[PDB]
Design an enzyme around this catalytic site. Structure first.
Site, mmCIF file in Angstrom:
data_model
loop_
_atom_site.group_PDB
_atom_site.id
_atom_site.type_symbol
_atom_site.label_atom_id
_atom_site.label_comp_id
_atom_site.label_asym_id
_atom_site.label_seq_id
_atom_site.Cartn_x
_atom_site.Cartn_y
_atom_site.Cartn_z
ATOM 1 C CB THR A 116 8.849 -8.704 3.954
ATOM 2 O OG1 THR A 116 8.750 -9.997 4.254
ATOM 3 C CG2 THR A 116 7.793 -8.046 4.603
ATOM 4 C CG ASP A 123 6.226 -8.628 -0.119
ATOM 5 O OD1 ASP A 123 5.535 -8.504 0.724
ATOM 6 O OD2 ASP A 123 7.426 -8.731 -0.266
ATOM 7 N NE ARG A 132 8.769 -15.800 -2.427
ATOM 8 C CZ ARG A 132 9.783 -15.831 -3.074
ATOM 9 N NH1 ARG A 132 11.000 -15.331 -2.899
ATOM 10 N NH2 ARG A 132 9.757 -17.008 -3.930
ATOM 11 C CE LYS A 147 4.502 -10.267 4.180
ATOM 12 N NZ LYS A 147 3.938 -11.287 4.692
ATOM 13 N N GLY A 191 7.984 -7.983 9.988
ATOM 14 C CA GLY A 191 8.582 -8.570 11.040
ATOM 15 C C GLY A 191 7.831 -9.872 11.333
ATOM 16 C CB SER A 239 13.402 -7.693 5.441
ATOM 17 O OG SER A 239 12.659 -8.646 4.297
ATOM 18 C CG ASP A 296 14.631 -8.517 0.178
ATOM 19 O OD1 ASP A 296 14.618 -7.625 1.176
ATOM 20 O OD2 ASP A 296 14.903 -9.812 0.421
ATOM 21 C CB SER A 320 10.255 -8.668 -1.804
ATOM 22 O OG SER A 320 10.575 -7.824 -0.654
#
Lengths: 242, 204, 244, 226, 229, 249, 231, 242
Positions: free
Chosen positions: D1, D17, D19, D33, D47, D129, D166, D169
């Protein structure tokens, strides 16, 4: 029933006499106001009169500073004037608080209008007996005037007047924008708009003025100020030398 | 331990072509003791199907809660409720209990009858519309299911092939689980008519 | 002040009585005729609209008929505005009972609850009553088909055949003369249309001025089919009975 | 994320992204998102997913109200203020990490709000994140006064580097470009990283391979005629 | 709930034949960091009562307020109601006392210890203690904080009982309070060289002697020993 | 103290609630407004009036937006109209846009507003709003819909109707003018023609306020790249457009 | 009822008639006399029986061991006010460790009347109180009206035939101010004062009610055979 | 029947209620406020109604916080309630902002409170005129507050029955000193004009009270005049009027 007009309830004519009576208590100070739009300013003048010398002239006022960009000019009794001023200042603070930018004049016109409506829908509220003029210079709408009245109705204007003899002033403004063929004076300095306004007031009311007989409020960009008597005198002198 | 894991219980839902399918097991137990093998977790409001997993008492409580509302909706709008708006409804009612939360997972399965579109949606404990057009899972063996489903699924299945896929996906995941397995029901949800088949599957 | 202007509308008269109730009943005889006839096979609710214009839309109109639940519907006569509130309160009570017992409400319970609500306004608060009269058509297993009428006082009575609104007394005599102890839904439909034909304030009785609904035991083994008809079906059964 | 919000002189581009994860499980390959506070004020949330959508819900309703009152187009800071308040009151029991970006009759704007009630300004903000991995690229390649072509580029490549450094992501890269004086463009799936390989054999099964214990029909269609 | 954040050190005081002396040092500690210097913890209320407040400066501000408010309340009415219905030490005491107790009971304490020092309209000494528990007690010698058992032994060595007060003269009392400030500045880690001092007399009223320095120290003998031995 | 909790509305002895009668008289005192329901849209039209000719009327509205599909237009009292529009938006958001996250059908909203009127008829300390409202909107299940909410709290659906002081004549005109198939263009011309019988004053697009619940506008959406959401079906026509239609009569 | 009705109205005379109605409560009340020297305050109240089988109704209420009030007018109102006064006197003992001052309590009582004169649905109290006490500023005698007027006097009266007592006090005014440290004399002078306000209602030893407060004496009520020393 | 409540209007702009309250104020005793350069001097006539009273034992001038004197006429208990309210508000400001309330701010507060009693059927408008003023850091100020909830600045204000005489005399005093006078010198003048305002009232005998808040002599706190100073003022007036 015998009560239609001690409480806010329609008549057999389908009407509210009470609110009428509110409009019949706006002409007791007999102050007149004249407000015109410049090109980058808004100018409003009101009478000042003291019936006695033993008053202090400074405190006698009708131009009340609500926001830093919105001036409020009141026609009608001064008690209700003060209650209205307090109302409006509260709402202004709260708008800044919740939305993160100073209150627009339009929004204030409407907020105060709705509060008015509420005073004439509750059976134990007395309506305000004041007509309020909101003068502002907006950056999204430009110089603007909004007038609200005891009914809770409001309307925009190019220019407007208030008072018992304000028909005279209506004539004056009508003829002026007739010649100009445009909805605002094209003047790039606020001073000369003060001057023009005082000229139309002298013509309309039929009486000359002095520094202690006037009260002047000017809304420029990002500010509102009131002139003191000293600066008003200068405007009067520059009128004669036009 | 954690409330959801005191029964178990799972729900799987797939879109096919011009059809959807939703399926659950019937085990309802308290921790070690399996109590009942006749407890439906799929309910239906009109022609939206609502599968519900997680904590036992919440299953039933949410069920009647939603009943109350969708009854309002019909008496008022004089139409059955569309699965999409029911998705929004689920989200809102979950988020109303944000403190003192619910411990559930709803899976919404339906077909738009205005375009003939399969529509599925997922949820977990507090809310969070889980968007998919491929499949949704929930329950306490959602892992096993996610793996099964991702391998077998092939976009735009036929209704009967969809039946085969979802059956096997459920069975093998359920006997890899200790909180599921006692029996299974598969709903094949067509556009006109809904087939309920109980599956023969190993007890324990 | 405020005691000054207080009218005191919930006090008695020297009669022991309530003018406001009487006045509400008076104003409902200004409202439309609503009729309930109970057959042994179902219940016919037939209501005549108050307004009719060739510019009025009468195709989304259910101004008089409302479903309280999918076993119990009402015919409404009086002030629509007040009635709307009671209708949604009624539905909420129905769902509450369904909520806590998981079993459909008897007609008894609902009629009485609404009566209590009306009673509260006349009893205290200084408020005016809700000026509505309800004819309830319902099916429950305990007493079967049930027909009820309740009035702005907050009193209910069961009936075999009843009329409310305009020309209560006239339609009642008619129903006396033409009632059978057991009837069909078809016979009941016929009687209903006829009674409204002899009491209608316009020379002609038309489908576009009729609201017409039934609850029928056509559906079998303890299912009832509500029907709120379309005006185009009302048209056809209006030609069946030979009015048009 | 990973969410990037990149400010440039002609507007603002905000990218994310698709996911969404639920712990080690990937809950969803596709969600959006990117939310809509207003047609001209988009935000993205990182979050707790539930807590993001529901709050943008709440304040989108509220700002629509406000805008209809003032008969004027909304502000960025209007939304930002409402948010700040609403979060501060639960005292950070609602975990929202939002990039609020938007144009208005005052220009381009880019703000970030935390889960406590903190807010920061920049020309250049990164949240989620995977924020770290985006930030790394973003500070070597950024400069003032980008154009929209450049800015779009930079945003999308920062998002991939997030994907590839990450684990939370991964997926398509959605972008929304908001320019001053123009309708906002939603470039959804601007760049697709990672396509699913082709199964080596089909797994369709013949009919009757599972057993049926019994069967019944029920018709939720309607209640009945006759 | 509430716990010490910013704190002062100690208030010390004693009785003498015609009145009371009360003194406090001028320090606002923020733990080890001596963050505030020149902070006054003696507060006059009336003109014959000095109220010395110890504990937190934070709570001390909000008691400082209420003393002034009480003066205002008391002055309200006839001109005879401020000449001779004026506040007394015994009145001021009770007011502070009651408010503190009730905040202790609600479990949100006003964390201070207060000495109220004055003389009556009757012409009597009044020196009394209250704290954040609601404990009250009177004594011929009183202190708060670390001086409850550092300075107070010395002062109680001059005047052991209340019948030795008419034997103690105001200048002996003076000496003792200076001496005990010296001892505090020695042996306590939060202490300031600056101290304010007030003398409440019943024959000339309140004289407030500000910003005294502690002088006449001994450091000569810390060059004749070395190490830890 | 306050004891206005007893209703100021009572039954009259002859059967009626006197206060709604007075309010309905007040509605025939105001401006004239009308609405026509076409097959492929709805058109609503009204007159702009002000106290003075020097007052602005562009900064003033009589067609207001409740939702991007639903507009309202009034005949009766201005002040009463203003507050009630705000309240309509209010309850439209709190009880359909938090519970289903989307805008309400036209009908649902109609009932939402009828309750507010109802509780202005009940509950001492109030009197009815003295307005009639046309609620024109479009929902996706019953198509285009036109309603009238009266001072009483009832509603009625119509195919075409008028409110204000010129209502009797207008309705008689619309009696012939309405047809089983009407085009939104033709309805625009018709509405102007009718309200021209109703208006004495200067006739321009600056005094005739026109709004259509017609078809969706992707340009008023404010964003692109979403085909799933579509634009407002409502549109206010500014003066320019309306000035062409003066000439197309 | 034109302007006479309600405690919210005016009154083109600037007045309100409710106040005067409530002062009639004083007029139909029985006479009571208060007088103070500089060391003693004395209230002498004329109790009054309903009939011969009935006893006399008390007229003096102990408020505190240095403070007393005596009613004239409606008993039920006197009861509200006396409770209130005791409440704040015990308050002042609690919070300030101080006797409640007379001058101050008059003002408290003032506001308590004012606010039932403010709101609609209130009433003015129909009882007038004489409040004596001895505090750190000496003796005090306050007169409390239904208007809410508190006044400080050397000696005053309320009731029926209050005038005949005032004239008596106008002659003997400078006598009882010079008598100090001899409470007996002040009491005798009050007996004589209320003799002028009889309707041939003779002073008996259970019709007269005395109450005193001194420098050195708590508040006391004499009744029964304690009053015979003065009769 | 528009005289019945305060929330009624009349078609004459009148609200008979509030006008009637003025007649309650016309029933009070003379009360003057002299605005001087250094501060303000209040004086009140205190009628001695009987020879049973305790003299100089009743104050009609009460202070609020410590720098605003308040003296009222009309109904003594009612004005008493008003002063209590103003002390509550003063203490609130003082707690919230850590400074003794400014005199204009005080004016706002009391004006709003009295204006409130005309908007509700529930209450009765106060029948008192108040005169309040003092020294704050932006100078000395004086205000007179109507039972209508109106007020203005004043260089000299008066109320009571001998207001006729007092107003005229104040006119003269501003004609003697157009640049003003000392608060020291004004003690004698207050004595003078109260005495002159007792010939309309010469049924009785009275006691003179004087109090003042000036920066130069009381250091900005509101104190009372006494002793030799008070008696000297008395003698001054006495000789003038003989």
């Amino acid at each position: 029933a015998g009560y239609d007009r001690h409480i806010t309830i329609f008549s057999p004519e389908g009407r509210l006499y009470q609110v009428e009576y509110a409009f019949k208590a706006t002409n007791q100070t007999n102050i007149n106001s004249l407000a015109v739009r410049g090109k980058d300013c808004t100018v409003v003048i009101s009478q000042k009169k003291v019936p006695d010398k033993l008053l202090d002239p400074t405190t006698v006022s009708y131009i009340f500073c609500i926001s830093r960009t919105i001036g409020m000019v009141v026609n009608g009794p001064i008690p209700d004037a003060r209650n209205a001023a307090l109302r409006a200042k509260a709402e202004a603070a709260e708008f800044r608080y919740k939305y993160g930018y100073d209150m627009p004049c339009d929004v204030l016109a409407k907020r105060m209008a709705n509060l008015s409506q509420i005073y004439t829908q509750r059976a134990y509220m007395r309506p305000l007996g004041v007509i309020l003029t909101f003068v502002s210079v907006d950056e999204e709408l430009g110089p603007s005037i909004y007038k609200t009245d005891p009914a809770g109705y409001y309307v925009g204007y190019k220019a407007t007047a208030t008072g018992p003899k304000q028909q005279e002033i209506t004539t004056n403004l009508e003829n002026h924008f007739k010649k100009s063929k445009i909805d605002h004076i094209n003047e790039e300095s606020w001073e000369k708009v003060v001057e023009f306004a005082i000229t139309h007031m002298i013509d309309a009311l039929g009486t000359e003025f002095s520094k202690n007989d006037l009260e002047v409020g000017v809304a420029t960009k990002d500010k509102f100020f009131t002139l003191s008597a000293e600066n008003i005198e200068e405007r009067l002198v520059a009128i004669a030398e036009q | 331990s954690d409330p959801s894991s005191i029964n178990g219980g799972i729900v799987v839902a797939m879109t096919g072509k011009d059809c959807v399918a939703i399926a659950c097991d019937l085990r309802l137990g308290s921790q070690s003791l399996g109590v009942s093998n006749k407890f439906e977790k799929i309910f239906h409001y009109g022609h939206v199907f609502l599968g519900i997993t997680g904590l036992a008492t919440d299953v039933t409580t949410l069920n009647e809660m939603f009943r109350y509302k969708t009854n309002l909706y019909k008496l008022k709008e004089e139409r059955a409720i569309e699965p999409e708006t029911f998705t929004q409804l689920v989200s809102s009612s979950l988020y109303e209990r944000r403190f003192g939360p619910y411990f559930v997972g709803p899976v919404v399965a339906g077909i738009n009858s205005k375009s003939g579109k399969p529509f599925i949606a997922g949820f977990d404990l507090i809310g969070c519309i889980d968007e998919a057009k491929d499949f949704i899972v929930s329950g306490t063996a959602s892992d096993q299911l996610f793996g099964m489903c991702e391998s077998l699924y092939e976009p735009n299945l036929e209704p009967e092939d969809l039946f085969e896929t979802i059956s096997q996906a459920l069975l093998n995941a359920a006997d890899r689980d200790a909180l599921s397995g006692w029996g299974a029901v598969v709903y094949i949800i067509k556009k006109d008519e809904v087939v309920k088949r109980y599956l023969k599957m190993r007890q324990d | 002040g405020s005691r000054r202007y207080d009218s005191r509308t919930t006090i008695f008269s020297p009669e022991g009585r309530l003018y406001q109730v009487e006045y509400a009943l008076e104003s409902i005889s200004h409202a439309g005729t609503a009729i309930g006839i109970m057959a042994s096979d179902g219940i016919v609710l037939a209501a005549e609209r108050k307004v009719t214009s060739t510019l009025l839309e009468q195709d989304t109109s259910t101004e008089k008929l409302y479903k309280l639940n999918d076993k119990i519907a009402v015919a409404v006569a009086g002030l629509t505005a007040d009635a709307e509130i009671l209708i949604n309160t009624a539905r909420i009570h129905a769902q509450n009972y369904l909520k806590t017992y998981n079993e459909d409400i008897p007609v008894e319970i609902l009629v009485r609850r609404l009566s209590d609500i009306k009673q509260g306004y006349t009893q205290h608060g200084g408020l005016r009553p809700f000026g509505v009269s309800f004819i309830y058509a319902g099916y429950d297993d305990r007493y079967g088909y049930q027909l009820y009428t309740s009035n702005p006082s907050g009193n209910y009575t069961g009936w075999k055949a009843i009329s409310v609104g305009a020309n209560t007394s006239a339609a009642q005599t008619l129903l006396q003369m033409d009632y059978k102890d057991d009837m069909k839904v078809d016979d009941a439909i016929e009687l209903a249309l006829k009674t409204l034909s002899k009491t209608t304030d316009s020379s002609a009785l038309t489908y576009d001025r009729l609201e017409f609904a039934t609850i029928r035991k056509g559906a079998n083994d303890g299912e009832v089919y509500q029907k709120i008809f379309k005006p185009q079906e009302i048209k056809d059964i209006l030609v069946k009975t030979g009015i048009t | 994320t990973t969410i990037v919000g990149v400010k440039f002189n002609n507007g603002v581009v905000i990218a994310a992204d698709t996911r969404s994860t639920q712990g080690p499980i990937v809950a969803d390959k596709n969600c959006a998102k990117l939310h809509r506070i207003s047609p001209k004020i988009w935000c993205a949330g990182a979050g707790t997913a539930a807590d993001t959508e529901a709050v943008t819900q709440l304040i989108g309703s509220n700002i629509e109200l406000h805008s209809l009152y003032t008969s004027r187009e909304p502000r960025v800071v209007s939304a930002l203020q409402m948010l700040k308040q609403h979060l501060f009151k639960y005292q950070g029991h609602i975990g929202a990490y939002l990039i609020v970006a938007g144009v208005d009759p005052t220009g381009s704007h880019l703000f970030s709000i935390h889960a406590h009630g903190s807010t920061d300004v920049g020309y250049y903000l990164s949240l989620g994140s995977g924020s770290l991995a985006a930030m790394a690229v973003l500070e070597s390649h950024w400069k003032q006064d980008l154009t929209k072509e450049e800015a779009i580029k930079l945003a999308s490549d920062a998002i991939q580097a997030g994907i590839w450094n990450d684990l939370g992501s991964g997926s398509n890269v959605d972008v929304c470009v908001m320019e001053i004086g123009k309708d906002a463009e939603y470039l959804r799936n601007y760049l697709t990283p990672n396509v699913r390989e082709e199964k080596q054999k089909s797994y369709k099964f013949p009919r009757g391979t599972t057993a049926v214990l019994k069967e019944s029909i029920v018709n939720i269609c309607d209640i009945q005629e006759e | 709930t509430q716990q010490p954040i910013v704190t002062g050190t100690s208030v010390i005081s004693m009785k003498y034949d015609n009145g009371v002396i009360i003194a406090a040092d001028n320090l606002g500690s923020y733990g080890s960091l001596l963050r505030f210097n020149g902070v006054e913890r003696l507060i006059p209320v009336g003109d014959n009562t000095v109220v010395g407040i110890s504990g937190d400066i934070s709570d001390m501000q909000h008691i400082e307020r209420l003393l002034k408010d009480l003066v205002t309340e008391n002055a309200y009415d006839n001109p005879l109601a401020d000449a001779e219905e004026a506040l007394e030490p015994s009145y001021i005491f009770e007011y502070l006392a009651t408010v503190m107790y009730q905040r202790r009971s609600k479990m949100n304490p006003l964390w201070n210890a207060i000495i109220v020092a004055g003389v009556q309209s009757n012409g009597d000494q009044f020196l009394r203690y209250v704290n954040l528990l609601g404990v009250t007690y009177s004594s011929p010698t009183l202190a708060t904080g670390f001086g409850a058992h550092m300075a107070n032994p010395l002062l109680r060595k001059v005047v052991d009982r209340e019948s030795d007060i008419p034997k103690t003269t105001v200048q002996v009392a003076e000496e003792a309070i200076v001496n005990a400030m010296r001892v505090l500045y020695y042996r306590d880690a939060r202490s300031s060289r600056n101290f304010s001092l007030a003398i409440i007399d019943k024959n000339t009223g309140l004289t407030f002697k500000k910003n005294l320095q502690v002088e006449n120290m001994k450091w000569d003998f810390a060059k004749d020993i070395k190490g830890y031995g | 103290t306050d004891r206005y909790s007893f209703s100021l509305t009572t039954f009259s002895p002859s059967g009626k609630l006197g206060q709604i009668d007075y309010a309905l008289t007040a509605v025939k005192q105001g401006v004239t407004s009308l609405g026509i329901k076409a097959t492929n849209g709805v058109v609503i039209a009204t007159e702009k009036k002000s106290s003075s000719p020097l007052a602005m009327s562009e900064t003033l509205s009589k067609v207001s937006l409740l939702t991007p599909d639903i507009g309202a237009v009034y005949s009766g009292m201005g002040p009463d109209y203003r507050v009630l529009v705000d309240k309509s938006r209010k309850v439209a958001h709190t009880s359909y846009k938090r519970i289903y996250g989307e805008y309400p059908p036209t009908k649902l909203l109609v009932s939402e507003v009828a309750k507010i009127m109802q509780e202005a008829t009940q509950s001492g300390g109030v009197r009815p709003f003295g307005v009639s409202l046309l609620i024109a909107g479009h929902d996706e299940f019953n198509g285009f819909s036109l309603y009238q909410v009266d001072p009483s709290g009832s509603y009625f659906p119509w195919k075409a109707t008028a409110i204000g002081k010129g209502s009797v004549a207008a309705k008689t005109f619309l009696e012939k003018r309405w047809n089983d198939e009407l085009e939104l263009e033709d309805a625009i011309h018709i509405a102007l023609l009718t309200l021209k019988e109703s208006v004495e004053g200067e006739f321009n697009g600056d005094t005739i306020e026109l709004a259509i619940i017609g078809d969706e506008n992707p340009d008023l959406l404010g964003y692109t790249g979403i085909p799933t959401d579509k634009g407002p079906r409502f549109r206010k026509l500014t003066s320019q457009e309306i000035n062409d239609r003066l000439e197309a009569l | 009822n034109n302007y006479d009705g309600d405690t919210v109205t005016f009154s083109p005379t600037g007045r309100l008639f409710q106040v005067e109605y409530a002062l009639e409560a004083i007029k139909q009340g029985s006479v009571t006399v208060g007088l103070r020297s500089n060391t003693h305050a004395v209230l002498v109240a004329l109790k009054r029986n309903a009939d011969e089988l009935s006893s006399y109704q008390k007229k003096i209420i102990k408020c505190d061991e240095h403070m007393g009030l005596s009613l004239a007018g409606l008993a039920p109102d006197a009861r509200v006010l006396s409770n209130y006064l005791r409440q704040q006197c015990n308050y002042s003992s609690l919070v300030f460790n101080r006797k409640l001052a007379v001058e101050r309590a008059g003002h408290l009582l003032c506001d308590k009347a004012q606010k039932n004169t403010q709101s609609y649905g209130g009433r003015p109290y129909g009882v007038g109180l004489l409040i004596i006490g001895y505090d750190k500023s000496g003796a005090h005698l306050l007169e409390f009206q239904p208007s809410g007027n508190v006044t400080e006097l050397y000696g005053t009266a309320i009731g029926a035939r209050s005038q005949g007592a005032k004239t008596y006090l106008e002659r003997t005014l400078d006598t009882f101010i010079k008598i100090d440290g001899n409470p007996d004399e002040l009491i005798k002078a009050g007996v004589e004062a209320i003799s002028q306000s009889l309707r041939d209602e003779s002073l008996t030893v259970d019709n007269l009610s005395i109450a005193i407060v001194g420098k050195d004496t708590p508040f006391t009520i004499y009744d029964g055979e304690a009053v015979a020393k003065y009769i | 029947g528009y005289d019945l409540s305060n929330s009624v209007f009349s078609p004459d702009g009148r609200n008979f209620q509030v006008e009637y309250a003025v007649k309650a104020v016309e029933n009070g005793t003379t009360s003057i406020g002299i605005k001087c350069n250094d501060g303000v001097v209040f004086a009140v006539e205190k009628l001695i109604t009987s020879k049973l009273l305790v003299p100089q034992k009743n104050v009609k001038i009460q202070v609020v916080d410590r720098h605003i004197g308040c003296v009222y006429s009309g109904l003594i208990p009612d004005g008493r309630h008003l002063v209590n309210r103003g002390r509550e508000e003063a203490a609130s400001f003082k707690k919230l902002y850590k400074t003794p309330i400014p005199i204009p701010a005080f004016a706002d507060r009391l004006g709003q409170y009295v204006q409130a009693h005309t908007l509700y059927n529930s209450v009765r408008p106060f029948g008192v005129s108040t005169i309040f003023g003092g020294v704050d850091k932006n100078g000395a100020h004086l205000y007179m507050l109507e039972p209508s909830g109106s007020y203005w600045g004043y260089k000299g204000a008066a109320t009571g029955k001998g207001r006729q005489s007092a107003k005229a005399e104040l006119e003269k005093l501003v004609d003697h000193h157009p640049e003003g006078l000392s608060a020291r010198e004004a003690v004698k003048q207050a004595a003078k004009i109260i005495y002159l305002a007792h010939e309309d009232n010469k049924e009785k005998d009275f006691e003179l009270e004087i109090s003042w808040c000036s920066l130069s002599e009381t250091n900005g706190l509101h104190k009372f005049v006494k002793g030799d100073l008070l008696q000297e003022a008395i003698d001054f007036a006495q000789k003038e009027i003989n």
